[PDB]
Design a protein around this ligand. Structure first.
Ligand code: BCL
Ligand code: BCL
Ligand SMILES: CC[C@H]1c2cc3[nH]c4c(c3C)C(=O)[C@H](C(=O)OC)c4c3nc(cc4[nH]c(cc(n2)[C@@H]1C)c(C(C)=O)c4C)[C@@H](C)[C@@H]3CCC(=O)OC/C=C(\C)CCC[C@H](C)CCC[C@H](C)CCCC(C)C
Ligand SMILES: CC[C@H]1c2cc3[nH]c4c(c3C)C(=O)[C@H](C(=O)OC)c4c3nc(cc4[nH]c(cc(n2)[C@@H]1C)c(C(C)=O)c4C)[C@@H](C)[C@@H]3CCC(=O)OC/C=C(\C)CCC[C@H](C)CCC[C@H](C)CCCC(C)C
Ligand SMILES: COC1=C(OC)C(=O)C(C/C=C(/C)CC/C=C(\C)CC/C=C(/C)CC/C=C(\C)CC/C=C(/C)CC/C=C(\C)CC/C=C(\C)CC/C=C(\C)CC/C=C(\C)CCC=C(C)C)=C(C)C1=O
Ligand SMILES: COC(C)(C)C(=O)/C=C/C(C)=C/C=C/C(C)=C/C=C/C(C)=C/C=C/C=C(C)/C=C/C=C(\C)CC/C=C(\C)CCC=C(C)C
Ligand SMILES: COC(C)(C)C(=O)/C=C/C(C)=C/C=C/C(C)=C/C=C/C(C)=C/C=C/C=C(C)/C=C/C=C(\C)CC/C=C(\C)CCC=C(C)C
Ligand SMILES: COC(C)(C)C(=O)/C=C/C(C)=C/C=C/C(C)=C/C=C/C(C)=C/C=C/C=C(C)/C=C/C=C(\C)CC/C=C(\C)CCC=C(C)C
Ligand SMILES: COC(C)(C)C(=O)/C=C/C(C)=C/C=C/C(C)=C/C=C/C(C)=C/C=C/C=C(C)/C=C/C=C(\C)CC/C=C(\C)CCC=C(C)C
Ligand SMILES: COC(C)(C)C(=O)/C=C/C(C)=C/C=C/C(C)=C/C=C/C(C)=C/C=C\C=C(C)\C=C\C=C(/C)CC/C=C(\C)CCC=C(C)C
Ligand SMILES: CCCCCCCCCCCCO[C@@H]1O[C@H](CO)[C@@H](O[C@H]2O[C@H](CO)[C@@H](O)[C@H](O)[C@H]2O)[C@H](O)[C@H]1O
Ligand SMILES: CCCCCCCCCCCCO[C@@H]1O[C@H](CO)[C@@H](O[C@H]2O[C@H](CO)[C@@H](O)[C@H](O)[C@H]2O)[C@H](O)[C@H]1O
Ligand SMILES: [Fe+3]
Lengths: 52, 274, 52, 102, 44, 51, 325, 41, 52, 52, 51, 51, 44, 51, 43, 43
C-alpha cells in the first residue's frame, strides 16, 4: 500500500502519521499489531476520501 | 349600563396622569388616560396584524403569521414586510400591555382597593417582555422573538425547545412547570372547596368557613385557611410566570449547550465514587 | 422574626462563602452552589431553631 | 447534536421531524454520515479490531472492539478541525490508487 | 432659625436612585457592552 | 440674578438628599465609562508608560 | 407603603380547632394530635390539623406506599443496591413499562412484570383516595365538587396508564415511573405521534391550563385587593355580599367589561381546572388510536403554517462568518 | 423621640468631623505611600 | 408671546419643575449615550485614534 | 467647615451612619477589586513576578 | 481585662449555640480543605507511604 | 476623643453581631482569595517546597 | 447598671471565668495538635 | 473544674437530641469518607485479600 | 444564674454522669482507633 | 442625648472596653501581618 509512494513522499507521510497517531515508531516493525492496523487504516482513510 | 350597586362607586378621581378629561365610562369599561393609549395601541397592533395578514396572502386565523426579522438584521429596524411590522406590533403590544396594567391601577385607585392585580399582571407582562425584547437584546437580534401567529408561535416554542436538546431537563423549566401544575391543582381544590360549602346536597344547610376549613384538615391534615389560599395562590401563579421568564432568559444567553448536559454538575461531583 | 431573619442571613452568607470556598479548591460554580444552597437550608434552619 | 456541537434545529424542523421538505441541507449530509459510520464500523473498524487489537483495547463489558461514530471525527465541532483543509496536502490519503499529485 | 415641618426626606432620593440606576446600567452596557455576549446562527 | 427663590417652591431639606445621591451616580458612572476605553484606563496607562 | 396582605404582620394562636362534626360522627376516625407551625403561619393557618383515618385513606396510603416501595426497590436493584449510585442516578432510574412485544399479556418481572404490579397498587391507591374525597364530602354534608374535580385528574391519569394501553394493544404505552424518564416519555410521545402542539385537545388543555393559572392569579390578587373589605371571607360574602364583592366585581367590570359573583368566580375557577385534564385525557386517548401523526392531521385540516424561506444556515450566513474568521 | 435639636447638632458634627479627618488622614497616607510604591500618573 | 407667564396659572410650579428636572436629565443621559453608541461621535474612542 | 452642623437636623443618625457605613466598605471593596482586575496594580501577581 | 461584660450584651444560650455550631463548621471546613489539597491529605499519604 | 458617642445611637447587641459576622466573612474572604492566587498559597507552596 | 440580658456583673464574673477556662482548654488542645501536625508536615 | 454549670443555660433534652443526631451523622460521615478512599475501604480490601 | 430551671445540686449531678458517659464513649473510641491504627495505620 | 436607651455615664465605659478589644485584635493582627512580611513579602 506504501511501496509505490516515492521516497520523499513516503518519508513525509510516515513522519506525519507517527505524529498524527502519537506512535513514534509506527510501521517500524511489520510484525507489530500497530503496523497491521495502520496499513488497514491507510486503506480505510483512502476509502473515506473517495467513496464517501 | 350599570349594576344594581355600581352607581355609588362611580366617583371622579383616582387617576394617575389623566384628570376629568378622560375620567368617564364607555359602557361597562372605564376609560382613562391609559385607557386612551390602550385603545390606540391595541387597535393599531390589531390592524397591523391584519394588514400583515393581507400582505402574507392569507386571512386564516390559524395561518396568519407575522414573524420577526432575520438574525442578520441584528437589533436594528427591519423592512416592514421583512420583519419590521413585527417590531412595530411588539412596540404596540408593549404599550397596550403597560397601559392596560396602568389602567388597572386607575381602576383600583378609584375603588379604594389594593394594587395586587396590576402587580400580578405586570409579572405576566414581564414574562412577555422577557420573551420579545429582553431575550433578543441578550442575543443581539430581534429575530429571536416568537412570531405573532396562532400556530406559528407554537412552532417557535417547539424549535426553541429542541434548540436546547430536550428542554425538559431545563432546571428553571422544571421549576416553572411544577408551579403551573400546582396552581391548577390549587385552583381546582380551592374552587371545589367554596362551591361544595356553598352548594351542599339538597335539603342541607350551607356550610360556613369552619366546615370548609376542617374538610382539608380531615382530608390532607392541614388547611391553609380562607385568607391563606388566596395569597399562596397568587404567589404560586406569580412564581409560575416569573420562573417561566427565567427558563427562557437563561436558555440562549446563559446556557448555549444542551440542557441535560447542564446536569453534569450533579453527575460529576468529587463525592460520587466514580 | 428578627432573630429568624438574621439567622437566615447568616446561612445565606455561609452559603455564599461555601459556594466560593469549594470553587477555590476546585469543583465548579454549579457544584459549589448546590453545597452552598444545601448549607443555607441546613445551618440556616438549625440556627433559626436553636438560637431563636 | 453533541458530536456536531449544534442543536436539533441545525438539521430539521422540530414541528416535523419526518418531513423531507422541512430538512436543512445538513440533514442530507448526516444521512451520508450514518451510512458511512455503519460502513466504517461493520467492514473497516470491527474486522481489523478483532484481528489485531490486544485485550487491553477491548470493551469493558462485551470485550468488543471500539467503534467510531459522529464525535470520533467531529470531536464536538460542526466540521472536523472546523473545516480545515487537511487532504489537500496529502494526495496519498485522497485516493486508493494513483495519488495524483498533479 | 429652624423650620419644623413634616417632610419625606428619602422619598425623592430613592426615586432618582433607581432612575439614575437605569442611566447607570445603560452607560455600562454601552461603554463596555454585553459582557457575556452570544451569537446565533439562523438555520431556518 | 434672582435664582434664590427656587427654595420658595422646592424643599431645601428634600433636595439635598436627591441631589446628594444624584452626584454620586454621576461620579460612579463616569469613572467606569473611562475604564471601558483603552485611552483612559489610567490603571492600564500606568503599565504602558512604565513598560 | 400601604400594607400588602402577603404576609401577616401579627398572628395569634389559641386552642387547637378539632372540627365541626355532626351525627355522621367523624370524631372516632379523626386523630387527636395537632401541631402548630409559625413558619407556615406567616402565609396561612398555623395549625397542623388531624388526619381523618378512614378506610379509603388507609388503603390508599398502604397501597400507595406499596407502589412507591416496589418502584423504589427495582430502582435500588437497577444499580445493584449501590446507595451512592442510587442517590446519584435517582432522577434517572425508573420502572420501565413492559416491552411492546408482550401486548396486554403479563410480562416477566424483569421486563415490566413489576411495573404491572406497581401500577395495579397505584391504581388502587389513587381510586381509594378518590373514594376518600367522595366519602369525606358526603360525611360533611358538603358538595362533591372536590371528588368531581379530583375525578377529572383521574381521567387523564387513567388514560395515560390504563385506558390508552388497553385499547392500544400493548402495556408498553404506559408512562414509566421515573423523574426524568417520564419527561423522556413526554417528549418521545409527542415526537412519535407527530407534534402534540398540533393536537387540538392538547392545545385546548393548554388553553385551560394557562387560564387556570391566569384565573388564580386574577382571583388571588383580586381577593387580596379586597381583603381590606373582608374579601377573604368568601362564603359570608356569598350569603350576604358586602363592598368586598361589589368592588371586586366592579374592578373587572370596569376593566374587561364583565365580572362574576363571589360564588360564580369559583364555578369559573373550577371548570378551567377540571377541563385541563379532561381535554388532555381526550387528546391522549385518541392519539395513536385514531390519529398517528398530528402534524399531518394539521396539514390535511389546514391549520399548519407554511414557511416560504429556506431551511439551511448557508442561506442566511456562512460557517466562516459565524466563527468570525 | 423623633427629630434632632440644635444643642446636639454642634457636638454630633464635631465628632463626625473628627472621624472624617482621622479617616482622611489615614487615607492620604495610604494614597501617598502607594504612589512611591507604584505611581498611577 | 409676551403673555406666556399665564402658564403658571395652569401648571403647578412645584410639580412642573420636578417634571422637567427629570426630563432634562434623561435628555442628557439619552443623547450622550447615543453619541457613545455611535463610533463617529465617541470622543473616548477618538482620543485613541489620535494617540496612534 | 465647623458651621455646617445644621444639616444633621434632617438625618436620623442611625439611618445615615449605617447607610454610609456600608457605602464606604462597598466603595472600598469595589476599588480594591478593580485594582485586582488590572494586570499592573494587582499586588498579588506583582509579588509573583517579583519572586519569579 | 474587663471583657466579662460581653455577657451583659449577648444572651449566653443564644451565643453559645451560635459559636458551638460555628466551631464545628469551621473545623469541618478546615479539615475538608486539607482533603482537597494533595500534600496534607493523610488518606493518600497513607496509601502512598504503604507502597 | 468623643468617639464613645457612637454607642448612643447604635444598639450594642445589634452592632456586635454585625461586627462579628463581618469580621469573619472579611477574614474568610481574604483567606479565600489568597488561596486562589498561586503565589500566596501555603498549601501549594508546601508541596512545591517539599518536592 | 446596664444589662441587656438581665444578668448581673457578679454572674458575668463566674460566666466569663468558666468560658475563659473553656477557651484556654480548647486552645491548649489545639496548640498541642497544631504543634504535632507541624512536626509531621510543616506548612510554612 | 467548674464546667458542671453548662446545663444552667442549656436544656438537657434540647441538646441531647441534637448531640445524638450530630454524633451519628458525624460517625456515618467519617465512615463514608473512609469508604471513599481505596486505601481504607475495608470492603474492597477484603475482596482483594481473598483474590 | 439559671436558664433551664436547674440548681447547682442536680446540675452538678447531671454533669457527673454525663462525663462518665463521655469518658465511656471516648474509651471505646480510643481502643477502636488503636485497633484500626494497628490494622491500617494512617501516619 | 441618648438614642438607644443607654445612659451616657456608662457609655464611655462601653467604648473603653470595646477599644481595648479592638487594640488587642489589632495587636495580634499586626504581629500576624508582621510575620507574613518575613515569610513572603508582597512589596
Ligand atoms: C419542545 C418544547 C419544550 C418546551 C419549551 C418551552 C419554551 C421554548 C418555552 C416554554 C415556556 C413555558 N413552558 Mg415549556 N416546553 C416544553 C414542555 C412543557 C410542558 C409539558 C407538559 O410538557 C409544560 C407544562 C410547559 C410549561 C411552560 C410554562 C413554564 C411556559 C409557558 C409560558 C408562560 O408561562 O407564560 C408566559 C407568557 C405570558 C404570560 C404571556 C403574557 C400575555 C400578555 C401580557 C397578555 C396577552 C394579551 C393578548 C393581547 C390577548 C388579548 C386578546 C383578547 C383581547 C383577550 N412546557 C417542551 C418540551 N417551554 C415558555 C416561557 O417560558 O415563556 C416565558 C417558553 O418560551
Ligand atoms: C415535547 C413535549 C410535548 C408535550 C407532551 C404532552 C403529553 C404527553 C401530555 C401533555 C399534556 C399536557 N401538556 Mg403538553 N406537551 C408539550 C408542550 C406543552 C406546553 C408548552 C409551553 O410547550 C405546555 C404548556 C403543555 C401543557 C400541557 C398541559 C395542558 C397538559 C397536562 C395537564 C395536567 O396536568 O394534567 C393533570 C393530570 C396529571 C398530571 C396526572 C394526574 C395525577 C394523579 C391524579 C395524581 C396521582 C398522584 C401520584 C399518585 C403521586 C402522589 C404523591 C403525593 C405526594 C402523595 N404542553 C410538547 C408538545 N403534553 C397532557 C395531555 O395531553 O393532556 C390532554 C399529556 O398527557
Ligand atoms: C403573567 C402571569 C399569569 C397571568 C396573569 C394575569 N394576566 C392578566 C392579568 C393577570 C393577573 C390581568 O389583570 C389581565 C386581565 O385583565 O385579564 C383579564 C391579564 C391578561 N392576560 C391575558 C392573556 C394571557 N394570560 C396568560 C397567562 C398568564 N396570566 C400568566 C400565567 C396567557 C398565556 C401565557 O397564554 C395569555 C394569552 C389577557 C386576557 C389579559 C391582558 C389584556 C390586555 O393586554 O388588553 C390590552 C390589549 C389588547 C386588548 C389587545 C392588544 C393587541 C396587540 C397590540 C397586538 C397583538 C400582540 C400579541 C403579542 C400578538 C399575539 C399573537 C399570537 C401569539 C396569538
Ligand atoms: C383538575 C386537574 C388538576 C388536579 C386536581 C386535583 N388533584 C388532586 C385533587 C384535585 C382536585 C385532590 O382532591 C387530591 C388531593 O388530595 O389533593 C391534595 C389530588 C391529588 N393529586 C396529586 C398530585 C398531582 N396532581 C397533578 C395535577 C392535577 N390534579 C391537575 C393540575 C399532578 C401533575 C399532573 O403533576 C400531580 C402529580 C396528589 C397530591 C393528590 C392525590 C393523592 C391521593 O389521594 O392518592 C395518591 C397516593 C397516595 C396519597 C399514596 C402515596 C404513597 C406515599 C404517601 C409516598 C411515600 C411515603 C414514604 C416515602 C413511605 C416510605 C416507606 C418505607 C420507609 C418502608
Ligand atoms: C371573587 O372576586 C372576583 C370576581 O367577582 C367579584 C371576578 O369577577 C373576577 C374576574 C374573573 C372571572 C372568571 C369573571 C369572568 C371573567 C372571565 C371568564 C375572563 C377571565 C378569564 C380568562 C381565561 C381570560 C379571557 C379573556 C376575556 C374574556 C377577554 C377580556 C379582556 C380583554 C382585554 C377584552 C376586553 C377589553 C376591551 C374590549 C377594550 C377595553 C376598552 C377600553 C380601554 C375603552 C377605551 C375607549 C376609548 C378610549 C374611547 C373610544 C371608544 C370607542 C372606539 C367605542 C367602542 C366601544 C367599545 C365598548 C369597544 C375575579 C378575578 C375575582 O376575583
Ligand atoms: C475607578 O473608578 C471609580 C473609583 C469606581 C469611580 O470612578 C467612582 C468613584 C466615586 C463614586 C467616588 C465617590 C467618592 C465619594 C463621594 C467619597 C465618599 C466618601 C465620604 C463621604 C467620606 C465619609 C467619611 C465618613 C467617615 C469615615 C466618618 C467618620 C465617622 C466616625 C468614625 C464616627 C464617629 C462617631 C460619631 C460621629 C458618633 C455620633 C453620635 C453621637 C454624637 C451621639
Ligand atoms: C478560607 O479560610 C481558611 C483559610 C480555610 C480558614 O481556615 C479561615 C479561618 C478563620 C477565619 C479563622 C476563624 C476562626 C476564629 C476567629 C476563631 C474563633 C474561635 C474561638 C474564639 C474559639 C471559641 C471557643 C469557645 C469555646 C470552645 C468555649 C468553651 C466554653 C466552655 C465549655 C465553658 C462553658 C461554661 C459555661 C457556660 C458555664 C458558666 C455559666 C454560668 C455562670 C451560668
Ligand atoms: C470533614 O472533616 C473530617 C476530617 C472528615 C472530620 O471527620 C471532621 C471531624 C470533626 C470536626 C470532629 C467533630 C467532632 C467532635 C467535636 C467531637 C464531639 C464529640 C463529643 C464531645 C463526644 C460526646 C460524647 C458524650 C456522650 C455521648 C455521653 C454519653 C452520656 C451518657 C449517655 C449519659 C447521659 C445521661 C445523663 C446525663 C443523665 C443525667 C440526668 C439527671 C441527673 C436527672
Ligand atoms: C476585595 O477586597 C480585598 C482586596 C480582599 C480586601 O482586602 C478588602 C478589604 C477591606 C475593604 C478592608 C475592610 C476592613 C475594615 C473596615 C476593617 C474593620 C475592622 C475593625 C473596625 C475591627 C473591629 C474590631 C472589633 C473587635 C474585634 C472588638 C473587640 C471586642 C471585644 C473583644 C469585646 C467588646 C465588648 C464590649 C465593649 C461589651 C462589654 C462592655 C459593657 C457591657 C460595658
Ligand atoms: C428509601 O426509599 C425506598 C424504600 C428505596 C423507596 O422505595 C423510594 C422510592 C423511589 C425513589 C421511587 C420514586 C418514584 C418515582 C420517581 C416515580 C415517579 C412516578 C411518576 C412520574 C409517575 C408517572 C407515571 C404515572 C402514571 C401516568 C401512571 C399510570 C398508572 C396507571 C393509571 C395504572 C393502571 C393500572 C394498571 C396498568 C394495572 C392493570 C392490572 C390490573 C387491573 C390487574
Ligand atoms: C430595555 C428596553 C429596551 C431598550 C432598547 C435599547 C436598545 C436598542 C438597540 C437599538 C440598536 C440599533 O443598532 C442597530 O444595530 C444594528 C445591528 C445595525 O445594523 C448593521 C444598525 O445599523 C443599528 O441601527
Ligand atoms: C432580566 C433583565 C435583562 C435585561 C436585559 C438587558 C439587555 C442589555 C442589552 C445589552 C446589549 C446592547 O448593548 C450593545 O452594546 C454594544 C457594545 O458596544 C453596541 O454595539 C454592539 O452591538 C451592535 C448592534 O447594535 C453591533 O452592531 C456592534 O458591532 C456591537 O459593538 C450597542 O450599543 C449594543 O448592541
Ligand atoms: Fe377564593
Amino acid at each position: 500500500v506504501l511501496a509505490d509512494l516515492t521516497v520523499e513522499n513516503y518519508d513525509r507521510l510516515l513522519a506525519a502519521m507517527r505524529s498524527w497517531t502519537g506512535i513514534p515508531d509506527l510501521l517500524e516493525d511489520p510484525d507489530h499489531y500497530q503496523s497491521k492496523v495502520a496499513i488497514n487504516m491507510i486503506q480505510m482513510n483512502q476509502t473515506i476520501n473517495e467513496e464517501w | 349600563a350599570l349594576l344594581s350597586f355600581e352607581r355609588k362607586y362611580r366617583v371622579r378621581g383616582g387617576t394617575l396622569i389623566g384628570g376629568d378629561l378622560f375620567d368617564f365610562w364607555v359602557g361597562p369599561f372605564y376609560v382613562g388616560f391609559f385607557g386612551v393609549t390602550t385603545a390606540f395601541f391595541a387597535l393599531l397592533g390589531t390592524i397591523l396584524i391584519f394588514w400583515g395578514a393581507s400582505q402574507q396572502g392569507t386571512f386564516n386565523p390559524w395561518l396568519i403569521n407575522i414573524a420577526p426579522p432575520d438574525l442578520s438584521y441584528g437589533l436594528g429596524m427591519a423592512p416592514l414586510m421583512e420583519g419590521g411590522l413585527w417590531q412595530i406590533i411588539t412596540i404596540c403590544a408593549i404599550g397596550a400591555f403597560v397601559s392596560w396594567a396602568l389602567r388597572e391601577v386607575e381602576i383600583c385607585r378609584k375603588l379604594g382597593m389594593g394594587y395586587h392585580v396590576p402587580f400580578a399582571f405586570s409579572v405576566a407582562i414581564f414574562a412577555y417582555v422577557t420573551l420579545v425584547v429582553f431575550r433578543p437584546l441578550l442575543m443581539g437580534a430581534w429575530g429571536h422573538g416568537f412570531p405573532y401567529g396562532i400556530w406559528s408561535h407554537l412552532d417557535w416554542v417547539s424549535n426553541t425547545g429542541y434548540a436546547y436538546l430536550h428542554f425538559h431537563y431545563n432546571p428553571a423549566h422544571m421549576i416553572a412547570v411544577t408551579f403551573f401544575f400546582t396552581t391548577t391543582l390549587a385552583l381546582a381544590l380551592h374552587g371545589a372547596l367554596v362551591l361544595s360549602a356553598a352548594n351542599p346536597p339538597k335539603g342541607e344547610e350551607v356550610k360556613g368557613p369552619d366546615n370548609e376549613d376542617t374538610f382539608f384538615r380531615d382530608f390532607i391534615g392541614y388547611s391553609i385557611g380562607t385568607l391563606g389560599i388566596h395569597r399562596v395562590g397568587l404567589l404560586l401563579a406569580l412564581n409560575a410566570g416569573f420562573w417561566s421568564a427565567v427558563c427562557i432568559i437563561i436558555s440562549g444567553p446563559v446556557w448555549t449547550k444542551g440542557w441535560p448536559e447542564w446536569w453534569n454538575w450533579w453527575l460529576e461531583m468529587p463525592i460520587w465514587p466514580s | 422574626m428578627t432573630c429568624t431573619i438574621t439567622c437566615w442571613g447568616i446561612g445565606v452568607l455561609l452559603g455564599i462563602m461555601t459556594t466560593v470556598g469549594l470553587m477555590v479548591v476546585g469543583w465548579s460554580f454549579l457544584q459549589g452552589a448546590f453545597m452552598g444552597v444545601l448549607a443555607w437550608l441546613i445551618v440556616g434552619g438549625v440556627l433559626a431553631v436553636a438560637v431563636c | 447534536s453533541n458530536s456536531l456541537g449544534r442543536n436539533c434545529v441545525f438539521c430539521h424542523n422540530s414541528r416535523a421531524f419526518y418531513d423531507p421538505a422541512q430538512h436543512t441541507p445538513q440533514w442530507a449530509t448526516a444521512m451520508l454520515g450514518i451510512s458511512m459510520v455503519q460502513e466504517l464500523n461493520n467492514e473497516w473498524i470491527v474486522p481489523i479490531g478483532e484481528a489485531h487489537l490486544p485485550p487491553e483495547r477491548l470493551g469493558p463489558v462485551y470485550n468488543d472492539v471500539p467503534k467510531l461514530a459522529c464525535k470520533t471525527c467531529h470531536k464536538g465541532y460542526q466540521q472536523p478541525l472546523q473545516g480545515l483543509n487537511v487532504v489537500a496536502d496529502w494526495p496519498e490519503l485522497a485516493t486508493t490508487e494513483g495519488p495524483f499529485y498533479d | 432659625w429652624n423650620s419644623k415641618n413634616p417632610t419625606d426626606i428619602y422619598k425623592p432620593a430613592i426615586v432618582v436612585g433607581v432612575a439614575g440606576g437605569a442611566v447607570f446600567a445603560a452607560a455600562l452596557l454601552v461603554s463596555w457592552g454585553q459582557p457575556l455576549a452570544t451569537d446565533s446562527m439562523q438555520t431556518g | 440674578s434672582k435664582f434664590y427663590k427656587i427654595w420658595l417652591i422646592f424643599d431645601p431639606r428634600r433636595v439635598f438628599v436627591a441631589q446628594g445621591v444624584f452626584l454620586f451616580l454621576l461620579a460612579a458612572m463616569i469613572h467606569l465609562v473611562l475604564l471601558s476605553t483603552e485611552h483612559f484606563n489610567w490603571f492600564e496607562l500606568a503599565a504602558a508608560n512604565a513598560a | 407603603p400601604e400594607y400588602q396582605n402577603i404576609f401577616t404582620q401579627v398572628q395569634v394562636q389559641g386552642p387547637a380547632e378539632l372540627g365541626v362534626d355532626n351525627e355522621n360522627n367523624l370524631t372516632e376516625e379523626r386523630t387527636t394530635g395537632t401541631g402548630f407551625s409559625q413558619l407556615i403561619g406567616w402565609i396561612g393557618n398555623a395549625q397542623l390539623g388531624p388526619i381523618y383515618l378512614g378506610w379509603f385513606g388507609i388503603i390508599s396510603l398502604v397501597t400507595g406506599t406499596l407502589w412507591f416501595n416496589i418502584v423504589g426497590f427495582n430502582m435500588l436493584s437497577q444499580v445493584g443496591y449501590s446507595i451512592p449510585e442510587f442517590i446519584r442516578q435517582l432522577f434517572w432510574l425508573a420502572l420501565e413499562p413492559p416491552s411492546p412485544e408482550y401486548g396486554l399479556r403479563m410480562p416477566p418481572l424483569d421486563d415490566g412484570g413489576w411495573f404491572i404490579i406497581a401500577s395495579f397498587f397505584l391504581l388502587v391507591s389513587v381510586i381509594s383516595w378518590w373514594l376518600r374525597s367522595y366519602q369525606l364530602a358526603e360525611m360533611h354534608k358538603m358538595g362533591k365538587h372536590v371528588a368531581w374535580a379530583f375525578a377529572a385528574a383521574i381521567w387523564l391519569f387513567l388514560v395515560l396508564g390504563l385506558f390508552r394501553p388497553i385499547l392500544m394493544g400493548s402495556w408498553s404505552e404506559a408512562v414509566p415511573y421515573g423523574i426524568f424518564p417520564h419527561l423522556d416519555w413526554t417528549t418521545a410521545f409527542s415526537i412519535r405521534y407527530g407534534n402534540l402542539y398540533y393536537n387540538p385537545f392538547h392545545a385546548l388543555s393548554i388553553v385551560f391550563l394557562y387560564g387556570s393559572v391566569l384565573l388564580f392569579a386574577m382571583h388571588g390578587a383580586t381577593i387580596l385587593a379586597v381583603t381590606r373589605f373582608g374579601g377573604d371571607r368568601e362564603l359570608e360574602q356569598i350569603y350576604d355580599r358586602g363592598t368586598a364583592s361589589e368592588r371586586a366585581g366592579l374592578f373587572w367590570r370596569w376593566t374587561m367589561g364583565f365580572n362574576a359573583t363571589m360564588e360564580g368566580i369559583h364555578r369559573w375557577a373550577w371548570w378551567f381546572a377540571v377541563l385541563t385534564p379532561i381535554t388532555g385525557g381526550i387528546g391522549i386517548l385518541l392519539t395513536g388510536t385514531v390519529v398517528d401523526n398530528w402534524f399531518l392531521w394539521a396539514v390535511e385540516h389546514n391549520f399548519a403554517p407554511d414557511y416560504t424561506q429556506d431551511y439551511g444556515y448557508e442561506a442566511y450566513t456562512t460557517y466562516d462568518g459565524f466563527l468570525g474568521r | 423621640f423623633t427629630g434632632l435639636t440644635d444643642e446636639q447638632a454642634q457636638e454630633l458634627h464635631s465628632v463626625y468631623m473628627s472621624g472624617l479627618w482621622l479617616f482622611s488622614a489615614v487615607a492620604v497616607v495610604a494614597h501617598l505611600a502607594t504612589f512611591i510604591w507604584r505611581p498611577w500618573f
